[PDB]
Amino acid sequence: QWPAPLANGGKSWASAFKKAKATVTEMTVEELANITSGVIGLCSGVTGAVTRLGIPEFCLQDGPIGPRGVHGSSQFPAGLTVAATWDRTLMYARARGMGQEFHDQGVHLALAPVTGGPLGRTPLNGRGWEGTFADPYACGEASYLSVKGLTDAGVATVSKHWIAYEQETSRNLYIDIDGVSQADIQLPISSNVDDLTMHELYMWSFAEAVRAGTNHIMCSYNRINNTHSCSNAKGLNQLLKTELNFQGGVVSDWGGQWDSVPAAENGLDVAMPGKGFLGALGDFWGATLVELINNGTVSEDLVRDKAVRILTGYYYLGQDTNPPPPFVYNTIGAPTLNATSGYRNVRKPGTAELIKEIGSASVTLLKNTGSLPLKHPQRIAVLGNDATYNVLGPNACGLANSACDIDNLNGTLTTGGGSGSALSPYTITPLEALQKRAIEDNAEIAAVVANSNTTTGAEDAIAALLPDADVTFVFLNRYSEEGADAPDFSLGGDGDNLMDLAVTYSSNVVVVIHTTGVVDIEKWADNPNVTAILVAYLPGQEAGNSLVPVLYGDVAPSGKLPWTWGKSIDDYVPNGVVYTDAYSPQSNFTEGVFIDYRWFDKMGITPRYEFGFGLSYTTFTYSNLIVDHGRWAKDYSSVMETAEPFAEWDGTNSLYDVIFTVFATITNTGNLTGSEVAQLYISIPGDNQPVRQLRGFDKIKDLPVGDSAVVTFPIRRKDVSSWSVVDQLWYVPNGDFLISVGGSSRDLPLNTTWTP
Amino acid sequence: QWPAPLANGGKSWASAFKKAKATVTEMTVEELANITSGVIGLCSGVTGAVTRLGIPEFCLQDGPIGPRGVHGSSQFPAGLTVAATWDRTLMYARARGMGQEFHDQGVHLALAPVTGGPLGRTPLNGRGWEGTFADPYACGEASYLSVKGLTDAGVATVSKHWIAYEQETSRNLYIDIDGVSQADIQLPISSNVDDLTMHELYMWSFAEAVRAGTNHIMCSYNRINNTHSCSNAKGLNQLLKTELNFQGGVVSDWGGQWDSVPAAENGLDVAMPGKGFLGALGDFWGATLVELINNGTVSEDLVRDKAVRILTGYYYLGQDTNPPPPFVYNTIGAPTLNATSGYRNVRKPGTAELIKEIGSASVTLLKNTGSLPLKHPQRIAVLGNDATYNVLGPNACGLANSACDIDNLNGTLTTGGGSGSALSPYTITPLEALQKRAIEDNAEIAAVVANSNTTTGAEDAIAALLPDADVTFVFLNRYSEEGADAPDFSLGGDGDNLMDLAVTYSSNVVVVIHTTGVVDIEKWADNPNVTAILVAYLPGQEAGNSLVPVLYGDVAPSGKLPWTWGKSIDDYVPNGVVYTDAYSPQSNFTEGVFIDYRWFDKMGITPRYEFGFGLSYTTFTYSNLIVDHGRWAKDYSSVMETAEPFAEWDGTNSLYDVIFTVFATITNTGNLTGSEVAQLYISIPGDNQPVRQLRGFDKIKDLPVGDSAVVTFPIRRKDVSSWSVVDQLWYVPNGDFLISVGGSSRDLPLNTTWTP
Ligand SMILES: CC(=O)O[C@@]12CO[C@@H]1C[C@H](O)[C@@]1(C)C(=O)[C@H](O)C3=C(C)[C@@H](OC(=O)[C@H](O)[C@@H](NC(=O)c4ccccc4)c4ccccc4)C[C@@](O)([C@@H](OC(=O)c4ccccc4)[C@H]21)C3(C)C
Ligand SMILES: CC(=O)O[C@@]12CO[C@@H]1C[C@H](O)[C@@]1(C)C(=O)[C@H](O)C3=C(C)[C@@H](OC(=O)[C@H](O)[C@@H](NC(=O)c4ccccc4)c4ccccc4)C[C@@](O)([C@@H](OC(=O)c4ccccc4)[C@H]21)C3(C)C
Ligand SMILES: *[C@@H]1O[C@H](CO)[C@@H](O[C@@H]2O[C@H](CO)[C@@H](O)[C@H](O)[C@H]2NC(C)=O)[C@H](O)[C@H]1NC(C)=O
Ligand SMILES: *[C@@H]1O[C@H](CO)[C@@H](O[C@@H]2O[C@H](CO)[C@@H](O)[C@H](O)[C@H]2NC(C)=O)[C@H](O)[C@H]1NC(C)=O
Ligand SMILES: *[C@@H]1O[C@H](CO)[C@@H](O[C@@H]2O[C@H](CO)[C@@H](O)[C@H](O)[C@H]2NC(C)=O)[C@H](O)[C@H]1NC(C)=O
Ligand SMILES: *[C@@H]1O[C@H](CO)[C@@H](O[C@@H]2O[C@H](CO)[C@@H](O)[C@H](O)[C@H]2NC(C)=O)[C@H](O)[C@H]1NC(C)=O
Ligand SMILES: *[C@@H]1O[C@H](CO)[C@@H](O[C@@H]2O[C@H](CO)[C@@H](O)[C@H](O)[C@H]2NC(C)=O)[C@H](O)[C@H]1NC(C)=O
Ligand SMILES: *[C@@H]1O[C@H](CO)[C@@H](O[C@@H]2O[C@H](CO)[C@@H](O)[C@H](O)[C@H]2NC(C)=O)[C@H](O)[C@H]1NC(C)=O
Ligand SMILES: CC(=O)N[C@H]1[C@H](O[C@@H]2[C@H](O)[C@@H](O)O[C@H](CO)[C@H]2O)O[C@H](CO)[C@@H](O)[C@@H]1O
Ligand SMILES: CC(=O)N[C@H]1[C@H](O[C@@H]2[C@H](O)[C@@H](O)O[C@H](CO)[C@H]2O)O[C@H](CO)[C@@H](O)[C@@H]1O
Ligand SMILES: CC(=O)N[C@@H]1[C@@H](O)[C@H](O)[C@@H](CO)O[C@H]1O
Numbered sequence A, B: 001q002w003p004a005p006l007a008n009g010g011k012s013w014a015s016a017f018k019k020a021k022a023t024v025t026e027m028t029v030e031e032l033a034n035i036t037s038g039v040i041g042l043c044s045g046v047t048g049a050v051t052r053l054g055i056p057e058f059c060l061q062d063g064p065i066g067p068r069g070v071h072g073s074s075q076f077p078a079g080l081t082v083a084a085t086w087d088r089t090l091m092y093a094r095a096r097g098m099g100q101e102f103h104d105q106g107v108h109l110a111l112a113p114v115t116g117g118p119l120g121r122t123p124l125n126g127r128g129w130e131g132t133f134a135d136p137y138a139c140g141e142a143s144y145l146s147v148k149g150l151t152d153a154g155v156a157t158v159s160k161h162w163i164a165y166e167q168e169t170s171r172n173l174y175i176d177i178d179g180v181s182q183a184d185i186q187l188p189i190s191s192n193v194d195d196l197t198m199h200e201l202y203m204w205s206f207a208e209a210v211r212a213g214t215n216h217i218m219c220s221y222n223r224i225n226n227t228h229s230c231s232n233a234k235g236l237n238q239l240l241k242t243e244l245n246f247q248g249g250v251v252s253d254w255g256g257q258w259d260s261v262p263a264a265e266n267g268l269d270v271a272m273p274g275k276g277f278l279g280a281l282g283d284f285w286g287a288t289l290v291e292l293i294n295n296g297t298v299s300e301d302l303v304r305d306k307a308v309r310i311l312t313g314y315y316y317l318g319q320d321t322n323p324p325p326p327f328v329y330n331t332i333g334a335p336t337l338n339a340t341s342g343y344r345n346v347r348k349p350g351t352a353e354l355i356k357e358i359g360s361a362s363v364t365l366l367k368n369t370g371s372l373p374l375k376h377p378q379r380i381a382v383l384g385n386d387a388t389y390n391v392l393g394p395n396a397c398g399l400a401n402s403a404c405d406i407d408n409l410n411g412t413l414t415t416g417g418g419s420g421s422a423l424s425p426y427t428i429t430p431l432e433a434l435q436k437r438a439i440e441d442n443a444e445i446a447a448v449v450a451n452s453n454t455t456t457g458a459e460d461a462i463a464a465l466l467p468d469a470d471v472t473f474v475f476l477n478r479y480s481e482e483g484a485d486a487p488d489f490s491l492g493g494d495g496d497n498l499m500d501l502a503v504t505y506s507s508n509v510v511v512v513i514h515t516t517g518v519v520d521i522e523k524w525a526d527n528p529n530v531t532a533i534l535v536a537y538l539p540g541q542e543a544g545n546s547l548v549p550v551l552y553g554d555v556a557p558s559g560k561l562p563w564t565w566g567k568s569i570d571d572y573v574p575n576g577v578v579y580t581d582a583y584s585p586q587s588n589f590t591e592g593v594f595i596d597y598r599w600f601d602k603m604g605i606t607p608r609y610e611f612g613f614g615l616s617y618t619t620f621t622y623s624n625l626i627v628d629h630g631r632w633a634k635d636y637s638s639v640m641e642t643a644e645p646f647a648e649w650d651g652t653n654s655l656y657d658v659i660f661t662v663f664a665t666i667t668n669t670g671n672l673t674g675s676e677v678a679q680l681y682i683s684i685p686g687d688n689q690p691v692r693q694l695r696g697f698d699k700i701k702d703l704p705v706g707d708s709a710v711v712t713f714p715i716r717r718k719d720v721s722s723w724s725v726v727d728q729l730w731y732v733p734n735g736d737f738l739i740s741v742g743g744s745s746r747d748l749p750l751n752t753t754w755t756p
């Protein structure tokens, strides 16, 4: 039903396309199959060279916190962490700093960012932390800035994972290793997604990634409507390549490809990893593709378009004129690849400070009963291994932060597990930073950082230490990892046990959570002995020194939640992860657009902490909502353009034109300076529409006591539109639109109406 | 044979004595027995009050690194550590800083310093680390300065332990607890010590303590010639109170007293702890003493002299006019004493910097093959739990640093175990300090700090980490404790195992030893993969930041060994610790004056590292020895004077007159600034005399490249004398005296002769 549309180079890539087409028109069939399937090298993926035309191998490298598996680089905080800052400037700079290091390590294509897959359908998603917000609009924006950041350095982006990749359980990558094949055990989970939900929820952040100029897109492990994402014609040829007008390459996830011909015809451009990882994850193209073209079952022209889309990026970013230096690190690992590593340091001055600032900007205050900010306590207790180093070393858990023992004391959770992680040159531990500050105050400080259930004496130590303390810091964590979902919301390690002891022996307990996602603090959150609670997410290498200034009052906490914190897992969307032995496992997205806070608001469920909630050390009063109908503007900035049909289209016009801008005022109404993240939600009228939909945020910085600032919200056409499944286009529905503004999805003291 | 001589107040205490005598002449018998036996309180010992005469309870408090069992204080480095600096200025300042804190915590009498018991007869002595050098002269000097330091603050000193207390094994303190009495199992080890050895070896450092004005002296647990030290008339009434003319009090060690009448007549003044510690350690005086006086078996006058000697100190230090504040801490511990603690911070600005400076001045370089000082390594590995915190907290091992489990990862060994330890407000770990410095150099750094034998993965982690490192730091330790000797010289914990792995996977291994004494590094010391070796002893709270500047070259290492480092325990004095079940265990000091280096030199044994050995980062050339016969001076300074008979005595004259001064020159002959510790040894002629005897040291500070300085050695009469057992006096023997000067007991390039 959907033929494969040819690349034309779209907006910004027009000249790169032309050079790309020149080069591809010279290529033989043996060379087309080379560039378009992975070969063996030091990087996660490597396209074969076209050595006669002077085109080298492309290093395709993990991952969304920066080049994975290398020394000489920095461990940036995770997508989850930057989203929690709600600060567009840090979202950009994070990505640009990642890009610099990617480039300087010799990566042509970054396997990043994660731009909407997983988006957020389960809070138990094992790799959910790799993305940003559980919300199409906010994810959309963070995705735009992350892409832009990486491309503005020399690196091509492979935005991932397209699409509806919402559980790790039964993701079932193609693998055939030691005679058992995943095709023989179980098919990948089928995400069954209606057309409205696909357009309004899952496609939104990918459109943004496409607008920002992603050079490529990774197709996911899941099947969509019982068809593999990487050979889904409706997915890749229609929705991505026609409607979103995508001009770059689809890259398979590693084992994302299940067949040769359907993938060649339904939208895949690059077979990865091909000959790498021993060919264990399927090796469907290469010489098999040459043979398919020469015997005439696969169009040679079709395959030229694949090569065209791979080279467009190469030429647009100027990788011919300004090549990256050689990649020097064995990031695959022996015995799978025996090969020696060189060494390069790419840590630039500024980067460490940026990583810190992100941490200081993200850490989210969930509860404060008066214990914070700390003045100058004299006797300080610290509990939890999370407070200090991994007992085996910061990088002991290996190339993907996932090979340490089940019970190992891993230390401060600075990134999650999997392909999304990265090595660290050190960890500034929360204990080191608390101690530095205790020393300044001539105070004492003592940590119990062992396993409190299993190490002799730990329990008695904690009993002996806590009573005399002015403050007890308890550091908790929750490791999760690619390739599995969390079974429940319960804390990692000895966390529950720590918290029972802590509140048994101290009435001034301050809780800090390093985590990949929501966790169960129900037993203690309303204990008055727990005086304060903060989530620091995954702060990367600067964990301790980003946190302590916030604790001590040097800066007010300013982060707010990028997803919903429900009291129980039962309060979320049902069937968030499906567990079957069924050969063809199915996940029917019956919830529709209603994920995260949309689920909560539609069904009248009260979270513990809502989407976009965060405490400061001061308060903010909202006033003087203004809807400026006259403050509208054309769509100029975008690197690339989509072809999303929409009803109001004429010759010169766009779905991303700003049709009005909204203003409001905040006043710092408390007794301290703070920054505030203002949020704007629109209720679009219609049948089965969410109560509220986030369509703007804006972060006021360091607003002094009693001062005021205006907060500004440009609204796009798309931002007020619905998808018509009958007409197959975006339209702006007739009706009354509620527009609300405030500190969170549930603290919105200003509202007005807008009718089109 | 030896009657108890009456106090007269000697030199400096004459006016205190008079006030003391006034007060005691008013006292009833019930009051004399009160002041003179211990009662229940918050301090290690407490004398009863004389409330009618306005005399309060005296807090007697542990210990030789500063007030034990308190919060709000600093953990000073140990006696062993300060001795290794060989710097008289730091020996003084250490003690004065301790004294300040003692005073400010409300201690009247400090159970410190350790001034010659144990001196050094075994290298396995479990509490050997509490003293200073294994050498009478050097110990003597450190003892003088330590006493002086504490008394110049408001605190009375209880110098310990008198005398020949040279093993912990069978020390057998009197205890009777739950119906088993130590009197029923085994008598204390009998130190059997000839008269020459007692005078020339064991009494020397106590004479110095007495000269410096110790207010009191603790009598030891051991027996001497099968008589309890605390009821030994020859010991306390003759040698201490007559010959050394001691004017202050003998205090029993806790369980040091075994009887009522002999102790009252043979020289004991204070029964400790009396009613404290449940009376479990003997309670021989109190009401029993009142009953002994009133029935006329103990002279009332004798007991008045006891009270006189206790009050002299009280009045001399001005504890009436300027009382210490209240002692506020329960340092005994529940259930033995149920009582609540208050809080006081006495940490003065300067103290932390002094503690650091001592560390930086003591750490001793034993081997350096070119790896030190470090330039700017980029990849740094660290091994050993000693590198980081105690996993249970710095103070988890309790009031005497000795209650943690046998296998517990205690972290950096900053002090030893027992009554000599102290709490710590923090520990600046070697890892923290190495990391700070790595960060400055844009480098990476990773530690494996778990148990390398028992924790899953640790071995693989170390294999994966070490090969790529520029440098591997391995941190080793050896805990020892009061009440036991070390069984052998072998490293604590996983140390052996660490070192096998380290040299298996790295050829640039730098070893740092935190320890209470000599340890066995024989298997690795000549491995060329071990590029450098340093012993940091017990640095107290500032371990990491005192060490790292030395490693990185900011200051050249300047410490030298305060004892001998033999290749095997068999190379030391035989029968260093006697192990019997024999009811009356015996230790016959047949070696004589020949302990530590004297044993080694007399028998032609080559240590690995000799007494007074230490490497710098530069070299020193010695020249131009001068013996100035005309540079002599009277004995003015001493706070108190002894009555040691000596042959050359006339009316006005003294054993501590300087009879000549010796000079030499050092030149910094290498390529860096360094400090040098010059040593002077005299060979006194006679029958069975040591090859060499240390009689001077002098530390030149920060001598620039190619510059020179004179090093100066005043020699006392006593310094050239022998004890005549026939005549019972100190005499200067006729004969030829060799005088040698140089960098160590075995690197003495200058020598001359002196004849009297
Ligand atoms: C299954 C898989 O995802 O493999 C890859 C290799 O390319 C894939 C991309 C992936 O991002 C990458 C690089 C990762 O970074 C993952 O975080 C990652 C994994 C998720 C992990 O894969 C798993 O845990 C699989 O569930 C696990 N699967 C199975 O054991 C399995 C075998 C037969 C049938 C069905 C399943 C597996 C373990 C070890 C090797 C291969 C497969 C292997 C892997 O070593 C890593 O795997 C290898 O390095 C590797 C794979 C095959 C052969 C040789 C090496 C992994 C790490 C780094 C730990
Ligand atoms: C035996 C002894 O030295 O006791 C004292 C109490 O005053 C002594 C002075 C000593 O310096 C002091 C304070 C210490 O600081 C020691 O480091 C110290 C010890 C060496 C230790 O003593 C021992 O380990 C003994 O070998 C051990 N001895 C025996 O178990 C024993 C019993 C009967 C016959 C023969 C031997 C012991 C353990 C616990 C209580 C009493 C005795 C007890 C003690 O708790 C500490 O002991 C107590 O606090 C205590 C003693 C008796 C009753 C109640 C409390 C210890 C510490 C702090 C651990
Ligand atoms: C297909 O790709 C391979 C792998 O990139 C090319 O072989 C490499 O070519 C480079 C130069 O581009 C050589 O330095 C390497 O030695 C080659 N590697 C290996 C493993 O052989 C190969 O030339 C490409 N084929 C064609 C037809 O261009
Ligand atoms: C997956 O299945 C859904 C459900 O059938 C598809 O939804 C239909 O899409 C067409 C246009 O493609 C519309 O005219 C129908 O009315 C849609 N139905 C619903 C219920 O939404 C969806 O497009 C399929 N997606 C893929 C990727 O195959
Ligand atoms: C420390 O990290 C390791 C991985 O490096 C964690 O071990 C994995 O935990 C998951 C559960 O999320 C299991 O499904 C895996 O099988 C474990 N991996 C291995 C290799 O055993 C470990 O849970 C972390 N430590 C703590 C205390 O959470
Ligand atoms: C013997 O000493 C005891 C203990 O120090 C004296 O009793 C204490 O006296 C102080 C004042 O000096 C009181 O505040 C305490 O309440 C007393 N403590 C106890 C436990 O009773 C006692 O007075 C002294 N006896 C004589 C005769 O002076
Ligand atoms: C312990 O025993 C030794 C050995 O008998 C005593 O040494 C004698 O001391 C007297 C003077 O007190 C001399 O005249 C003897 O010649 C000494 N003999 C030796 C072999 O040195 C020693 O004084 C005794 N010490 C104590 C503390 O009792
Ligand atoms: C950590 O310190 C503890 C004491 O706080 C050490 O345990 C003692 O070790 C000695 C041997 O020197 C035994 O005789 C004692 O019985 C032990 N004490 C207890 C209470 O069990 C321990 O050895 C130290 N840890 C390491 C690794 O050396
Ligand atoms: C606007 C919209 O979402 N409409 C419905 C849609 O159902 C489609 C649609 O009515 C039309 O194209 O015909 C088919 C075939 O009978 C029908 O399935 O999508 C949802 C289903 O999830 C409907 O409930 C909507 O009302
Ligand atoms: C100077 C000296 O040490 N002399 C000897 C001493 O032995 C004594 C001494 O000879 C004299 O007082 O008489 C008694 C009794 O016969 C004798 O023991 O000490 C040592 C013993 O350790 C002798 O070997 C010395 O020669
Ligand atoms: C336009 C498109 O791509 N898809 C279909 C098309 O079959 C139909 O003719 C159109 C009416 O405009 O409605 C959509 O359901």
Ligand SMILES: CC(=O)N[C@@H]1[C@@H](O)[C@H](O)[C@@H](CO)O[C@H]1O
Residues within 6 Å of the ligand: B725, B726, B727, B728
């Ligand atoms: C003086 C002294 O205290 N002790 C004795 C003494 O018995 C003897 O008369 C004297 C000769 O001067 O020799 C010592 O052995």
Ligand SMILES: *[C@@H]1O[C@H](CO)[C@@H](O)[C@H](O)[C@H]1NC(C)=O
Residues within 6 Å of the ligand: A334, A335, A336, A337, A338
């Ligand atoms: C790497 O070397 C190991 C032996 O150490 C061997 O098992 C393996 O075959 C090698 N790997 C490859 C891909 O050849």
Ligand SMILES: *[C@@H]1O[C@H](CO)[C@@H](O)[C@H](O)[C@H]1NC(C)=O
Residues within 6 Å of the ligand: A503, A504, A505, A506, A507, A527, A528, A529
């Ligand atoms: C709070 O802590 C105190 C100890 O400070 C304890 O006695 C009390 O039971 C605790 N309260 C709760 C609700 O846990």
Ligand SMILES: *[C@@H]1O[C@H](CO)[C@@H](O)[C@H](O)[C@H]1NC(C)=O
Residues within 6 Å of the ligand: B334, B335, B336, B337, B338
């Ligand atoms: C201290 O209290 C405990 C009970 O917790 C008791 O066993 C003991 O008798 C008390 N100690 C003293 C010396 O009275």
Ligand SMILES: *[C@@H]1O[C@H](CO)[C@@H](O)[C@H](O)[C@H]1NC(C)=O
Residues within 6 Å of the ligand: B503, B504, B505, B506, B507, B527, B528, B529
């Ligand atoms: C020194 O280390 C290397 C690894 O760098 C190892 O191969 C060699 O066996 C080691 N030598 C000794 C003497 O331990």
Ligand SMILES: OC[C@H]1O[C@@H](O)[C@H](O)[C@H]1O
Residues within 6 Å of the ligand: A044, A061, A062, A063, A111, A253, A254, A255, A419, A420, A482
């Ligand atoms: O780059 C991350 C993705 O690419 C590969 O490494 C894996 O297939 C995914 O986890």
Ligand SMILES: OC[C@H]1O[C@@H](O)[C@H](O)[C@H]1O
Residues within 6 Å of the ligand: B044, B061, B062, B063, B111, B253, B254, B255, B419, B420, B482
């Ligand atoms: O002060 C130390 C000494 O005093 C008491 O605490 C014990 O008897 C000895 O170890």
